[PDB]
Design a protein around this nucleic acid. Structure first.
Lengths: 345, 785, 285, 200
RNA sequence: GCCGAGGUAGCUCAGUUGGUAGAGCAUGCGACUGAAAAUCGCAGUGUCCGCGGUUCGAUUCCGCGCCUCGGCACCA
């Protein structure tokens, strides 16, 4: 502050001392002899020249240099700051554990050649259970609890942007989108559809109203059960490491035949975790996609095609992996709870 | 290479379309660099016969008397200007290329020059502008145009790879085309030799430098210029013609990778010795030099009884004075296989880049010297008349190529294809191979010229090349990776995830070179560079970076110099070398910093960058402390080392104003950690539901004391039920007992079960009060106000 | 990006209580449930902010945090179904902890917005336009790459009092926003002309107004252009506001012959006069 | 920084194809760099790359399984040195891609440079065939230049591969046939060196 | 290894009849300034690759090496 700007203007006085001098000095040898100086060689061309000139350097370089040592010292007295002290209060930020858990599972599979599409939350009976072989008055309808919707205005665009005829609701499972994909696109493909799902259920520590699932399929010529066994395994390996096992047991699902429930060995967890349910897609699900495609003048695509699909609730893993108590927490949007997952990669 | 089209069609006729060829070759593996049409012979350039050459008095010019089928003079200055040869006359009024100007009838020193005889460059057939073209005087009917016998040419610059040394001669190439379906017309130069003893010997001294040698003898030589088609060829290839004898040496070199020298027997002595050049030996290498020799060099020498003398530096140059010219009448033709490295070093030593060395350094058919002899002598016998001796001097027995396994199906299991056996046999069997097998494993012996064919696999790319790389179908693999490979991406992603966060955070990524100028060590006051380069790009790009900040600041400076930016918050994560090799994270702050643009007040400097650090750290799941500790380069008063999750990984501070002034730039703040930093796993603490005790206080503590000190004390005396703990007000001055600083703390207690009975927060506060007294730290409600 | 930026992700239910439509002064819920979980979880969300603030409140009620900068990106239902991005600011904001002065409020959250936008390769303007729920004096709609995707403002103090909580600032865009492809402009090597000025303009006028005028009158060779000082009062002719501008010219070839920056400045001076905007070197001082 | 976008994008393309990304040391050692990849000295193959040869005391070049290395010091011309450092430490099969900074002794201009970045990689296991590389190199053309993109294979010479080739990719709207890289079926002698070393 | 050119500031660079070794710009200080831009008025940092010498300043010359260039042909 004090000795810096004072002498830097004061050495500039010397920079102005070099040219108030530089002129009188340059106004002797250059003005008395431009063409006639090499005629007036000894005495004059040596006195007012050579001699005085070295002043125009020693005083220049000294007020230019003998100022840095005294000024640069004035800053050594100033910032004598406390290194440790809360610095500017920037916002941290951070993700939500469903996002980490979801993205992680999205990666695991993408890394296996899978693509992730996302479907509408507000579905329509036909697309949701129906197209997936779940007709009404079916104790299969009793396996899911639907929030049935009502309201005027909402336009439910289906697959190829066309509007849909059906009864409105909130998607129980992400499968509705498994069919919305198959009408719009042609095989083969490997896709995974993550999203929020809605059940008419009694909120507690292990059960919930809203939730997230990730389901997916791989359809194409020649796909076999062996393939789903292959995948569901790779998911066990990348999630619980190289001493992890998978288990398959038959189970009933309207959209798949054969059907099964995978359970995964959690090496250090010591228990046999449950996880999801999958199976080789049902023939009638291919008929519905083609029936619909034809309604839209879209040549049929799933004639000679085989295909498996799987589905597992994110919500569970997110509790097993990131060790959480009750399911309510995520949606109970609480700060001190959420703030523990701001640090996860 | 440099491939004259017509010439190639000589060995493989029915080739047609130089573009269809270029295509064919690049499919075989040869990248044509450029295609060129050459030989635009003007209509006005005709062929004249020189009748006489008379000097024009006391001047250098010569007045030649020609006949473009109608006797006419022209005065030349050129040396080669003599009677007896054929020349290329550019009649007056003839527009020339390399000349740019037009020829006309002109008066020179007393004579009327009717046009002018041209040099190669003048006509435009090669860069040799020091001498007229020289053709056999009987060449073409005196007066016919030259264009008639010099049809334009297409020449293509190939890119022959190092493994393909058979592809350095037209016939190597030819042979490859033949594999695709083309007919091979191998010229048979069958000579007429009479059996008589050759008047020279051949004694080889170092057989592992010249494994295979050959000396052939042709005498009775009628040295003249080489016929047109042969001049057209040499030029067409990018060479200059000399005399039928030497041209036949180049012609066959070009025709099949064989470098050969013809030595005038005059200068041979008793015979040819091939040895290692003895110390103190100097030769006048053909291009006109006195290359003082080294004992590593290999030399072709001749001897006269006692002394042994250098005639050419083996496998590279030669010439000297033993070179073939006008008065040649007999020659010893050299055709040997030299050891690649004995040449490759010698030639890379003397600064030589010969068509012939280049050929030898790659390698030559170690069984093609004998056939090469015949081509050259039969050629020489025709072109130069020479009577040749049926008797060469072969020194060095070569060994026939080894036979490779080759299981046709292996070839297929490897390519994903399904080429039938039969088909793949033919491919090799017509690439010129010895396939002696019953099947399934066949045992193939490659022709002598294919050095590139050692393993069975060399053989598979032979089948998938003739067949076409465009016949290997697409397919993808499916497989369960081995257990141990599973996860190797993890270290990586964690580093990539760091650049991401460092980015959304608010840092602009920079990339700087990894070269450090040794110089900086002093400017930045850091430990001397660990590694230095043996061949730096510049004295300043001499050693490698021990730190990233030198460059980060350097880089910053260059920005003020150019863009005068107001602030910048960059970051970099390159490799740093010293002792070991590490990944480092660094970044510098600078300028005004955050705040309001239309408000006179900013928020910046050290605490800015210090805040950006804690912001970062928290979002990383890691613990961050900066403790003080001056570092050589930083500023004494604002310098501390970064402490992540317990440990010291780097520093954070300002810059030492010495350097600031030293580098013309103002204040900068920076840091450099070392990666990877640690990773602390998710510790899920369930929070309580019952409210928290919001109590509060302040401490006096001595001026030059640290925050992290008071704070670490407060926190461990606070016990387990403390929650938050934040400094919210600092104080310097009175009502404080001079030389102290009041640090205000928002406290916060919470029980993870029932609530806090208050008297409990009190006794808690008691220990904190206690440990302050037990340290010399007074209060507000107890010790100073 | 919303995360490294400095926003803590929140997830809220998609159920809306019909009730809010009045509290938050917004258009009536489009869909209702036939079997709601509770009268309050009866219809679905037309906006995300109701819940974001709701959620915030519950945090004061429980944790008494000092500030919070959250963000959410759930599904919103009305007419069609969309993805929305919203987030609210609150409390003291950035600044120094042992310094009595913070930096926060609207311009804080407004700055976090432009910070975000830039790092997105997108253009961002906030033009004024009171919205039913926001505060009349601090309410404008977000304009990304030319278009209106949402709003940014404070809260209508009616509701603040209605909901026991203090001032909050928020925004809600609709996704996806656009994506502008990489336009690689090569920069020049020759220095730039650093000229400068100030404009008087009538009090209730907008910044984005003066600025849009300055910029298109500046011509093609303008580079940067930043407000660096604002003024309310005398020596100004009562009821005006002097906006100071750091200009900057640069030629992508040769340099600028100065008299050229001048004639350039002439058009800017011109269009200010042609609008009623006086200067410093010409119209008020 | 654009190398990061460009790198990460290419890292994704392939990871999405089942590939893992490991990263190697910048300061390599003659044996590991060209040598182990069938490039002995006095080989016009050595002439295809221009090495910054290094000198200094102190630096400890830890190889694969943390063991120190005997060889001459340098700056990696290509990222292949790490292709072998992977094969000694791990067992097959695997699909990996090794990105990194590379260093050539070259004349800096608009199209040539001193420092640069490459991404190389391999897939080794029982039954892998050329058809497979054709398969991959294609998938890279598709995900980079969309569904009307083609790939071209022509033979070329590389010491570490037999057969060898150079891929060129059709850039639909670019109208030209971009060059890109060079690949090939790994050479038998590269497997011998890895095993020779493993046994050491 | 070669035949001839450039290397001038905080950028870009003409560059000689050497006399203001700059000009476009851009840089700092004193009036105008709530505060900055034009005008005013004032002077400047610049190893002119690095070093040997020459005039007054050492870039008009002449040395060796440097950094960038156009022609000699084969390289992830």
């Amino acid at each position: 502050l004090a000795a810096i700007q004072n002498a830097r203007d004061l050495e500039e006085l010397k920079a102005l001392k070099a040219r108030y001098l530089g002129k009188k000095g340059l106004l002797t040898q250059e003005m008395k002899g431009l063409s006639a100086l090499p005629l007036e060689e000894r005495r004059k061309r040596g006195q007012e020249l050579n001699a005085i000139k070295a002043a125009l350097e020693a005083a220049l370089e000294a007020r230019e240099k003998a100022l840095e040592e005294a000024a640069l010292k004035e800053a050594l007295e100033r910032e004598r700051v406390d290194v440790s002290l809360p610095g500017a209060s920037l916002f941290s930020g951070g993700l939500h554990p469903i996002t980490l858990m979801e993205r992680e599972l999205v990666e695991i599979f993408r890394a296996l050649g899978y693509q992730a599409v996302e479907g509408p939350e507000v579905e329509s009976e036909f697309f949701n259970f129906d197209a997936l072989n779940i007709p009404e008055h079916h104790p299969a309808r009793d396996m899911w609890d639907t929030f049935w919707l009502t309201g005027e205005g909402f336009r439910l665009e289906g697959p190829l942007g066309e509007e849909v005829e059906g009864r409105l609701l909130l998607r129980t499972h992400t499968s509705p989108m498994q069919v919305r994909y198959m009408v719009a696109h042609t095989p083969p493909f490997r896709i995974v559809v993550p999203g929020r799902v809605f059940r008419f259920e009694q909120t507690d520590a292990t059960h919930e109203a809203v939730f997230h699932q990730l389901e997916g399929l791989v359809v194409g010529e020649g796909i076999a059960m062996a393939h789903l066994k292959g995948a569901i395994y790779e998911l066990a390996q990348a999630l619980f490491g190289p001493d992890s096992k998978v288990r398959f047991q038959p189970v009933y699902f309207p959209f798949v035949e054969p059907g099964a429930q995978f359970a995964v060995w959690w090496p250090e967890g010591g228990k046999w975790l449950e996880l999801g349910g999958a199976g080789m897609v049902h023939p009638k699900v291919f008929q519905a996609v083609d029936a619909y495609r034809e309604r839209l003048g879209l040549p049929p695509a799933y004639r000679g095609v085989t295909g498996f699909a799987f589905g597992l609730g994110v919500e569970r893993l997110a509790m097993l992996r990131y060790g959480i108590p009750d399911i309510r927490y995520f949606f109970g949007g609480r700060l001190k709870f959420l703030e523990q997952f701001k640090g996860v990669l | 290479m440099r491939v004259p089209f017509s010439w190639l069609k000589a060995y493989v006729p029915e080739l047609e379309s130089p573009e269809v060829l270029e295509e064919r070759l690049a499919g075989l593996g040869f990248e044509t660099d450029r295609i060129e049409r050459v030989f635009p012979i003007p209509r006005g350039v005709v062929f004249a016969r020189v009748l006489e050459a008379h000097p024009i008095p006391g001047t250098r010019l010569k007045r030649l008397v020609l006949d473009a089928g109608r006797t006419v003079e022209v005065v030349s200055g050129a040396e080669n200007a003599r009677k007896g040869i054929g020349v290329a006359l550019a009649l007056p009024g003839t527009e020339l290329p390399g000349l740019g100007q037009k020829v006309g009838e002109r008066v020179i020193q007393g004579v009327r020059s009717f046009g002018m005889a041209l040099s190669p460059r003048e006509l435009g057939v090669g860069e040799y502008g020091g001498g007229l073209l020289e053709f056999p005087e009987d060449a073409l009917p005196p007066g016919t145009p030259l264009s008639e016998a010099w049809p334009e040419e297409v020449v293509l610059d190939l890119e022959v790879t190092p493994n393909r040394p058979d592809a350095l001669g037209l016939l190597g190439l030819a042979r490859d085309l033949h594999a695709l379906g083309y007919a091979l017309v191998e010229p048979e130069a069958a000579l007429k030799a009479e059996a008589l003893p050759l008047p020279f010997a051949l004694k080889v001294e170092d057989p592992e430098g010249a494994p295979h040698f050959t000396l052939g003898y042709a005498f009775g030589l009628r040295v003249a210029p080489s016929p047109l088609w042969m001049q057209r060829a040499l030029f067409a290839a990018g060479m200059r013609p000399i005399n039928n004898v030497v041209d036949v040496t180049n012609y066959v070199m070009l025709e099949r990778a064989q470098p050969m020298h013809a030595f005038d027997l005059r200068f041979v002595g008793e015979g040819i010795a091939v040895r290692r050049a003895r110390e103190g030996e100097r030769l006048k290498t053909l291009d006109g030099v006195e290359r003082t020799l080294h004992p590593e060099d290999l030399v072709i020498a001749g001897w006269r009884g006692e002394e042994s003398f250098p005639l050419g530096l083996a496998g590279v140059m030669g010439g000297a004075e033993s070179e073939v010219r006008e008065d040649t009448e007999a020659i010893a033709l050299e055709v040997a296989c030299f050891d690649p490295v004995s040449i490759r070093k010698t030639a890379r030593r003397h600064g030589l880049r010969t068509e012939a060395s280049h050929r030898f350094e790659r390698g030559v058919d170690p069984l093609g010297q004998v056939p090469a002899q015949r081509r050259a002598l039969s050629l020489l016998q025709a072109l130069a008349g020479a009577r040749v001796a049926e008797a060469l001097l072969e020194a060095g027995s070569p060994k026939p190529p080894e036979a490779i396994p080759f299981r046709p199906e292996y070839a297929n299991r490897l390519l994903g294809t399904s080429y039938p056996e039969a088909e793949q046999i033919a491919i090799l069997k017509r690439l010129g191979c010895r396939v002696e097998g019953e099947g399934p494993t066949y045992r193939v012996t490659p022709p002598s010229h294919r050095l590139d064919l050692r393993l069975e696999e060399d053989l598979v790319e032979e089948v998938a090349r003739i067949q076409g790389y465009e016949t290997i179908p697409l397919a993808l693999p499916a497989f369960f990776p081995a257990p141990d490979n599973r996860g190797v991406e993890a270290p990586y992603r964690k580093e990539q995830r760091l650049r991401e966060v460092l980015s959304g955070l608010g840092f602009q990524e920079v990339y700087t070179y990894s070269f450090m100028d040794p110089e900086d060590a002093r400017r930045f006051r850091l430990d001397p560079p660990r590694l230095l380069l043996l061949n730096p790009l510049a004295p300043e790009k001499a050693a490698l970076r021990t730190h990233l900040f030198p460059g980060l600041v350097r880089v910053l400076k260059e920005n003020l110099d150019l863009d005068r930016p107001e602030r910048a918050l960059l970051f970099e994560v390159g490799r740093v070398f010293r002792e070991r090799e590490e990944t480092h994270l660094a970044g510098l702050l600078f300028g005004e910093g955050v705040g309001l643009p239309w408000a006179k007040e900013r928020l910046s400097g050290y605490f800015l960058l210090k805040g950006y650090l804690e912001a970062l750290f928290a979002r990383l799941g890691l613990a961050f402390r900066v403790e003080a500790q001056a570092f050589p380069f930083l500023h004494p008063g604002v310098s501390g080392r970064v402490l992540v999750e317990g440990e010291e990984v780097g520093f954070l501070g300002a810059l030492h104003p010495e350097i600031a002034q030293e580098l013309e730039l103002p204040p900068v703040h920076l840091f450099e950690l070392r990666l990877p930093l640690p990773d602390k796993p998710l510790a899920f603490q369930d929070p309580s539901r019952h409210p928290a005790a919001f109590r509060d206080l302040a401490v006096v503590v001595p001026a030059p004391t640290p925050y992290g000190e008071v704070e670490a004390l407060v926190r461990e005396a606070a016990g387990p039920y403390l929650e938050s703990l934040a400094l919210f007000d600092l104080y310097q001055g009175p009502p404080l007992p001079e030389g102290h600083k009041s640090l205000a703390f928002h406290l916060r207690f919470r029980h993870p079960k029932r609530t806090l009975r208050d008297e409990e927060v009190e006794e808690a506060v008691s220990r904190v009060a206690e440990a302050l007294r037990a340290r010399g730290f007074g209060l507000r409600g107890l010790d100073t106000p």
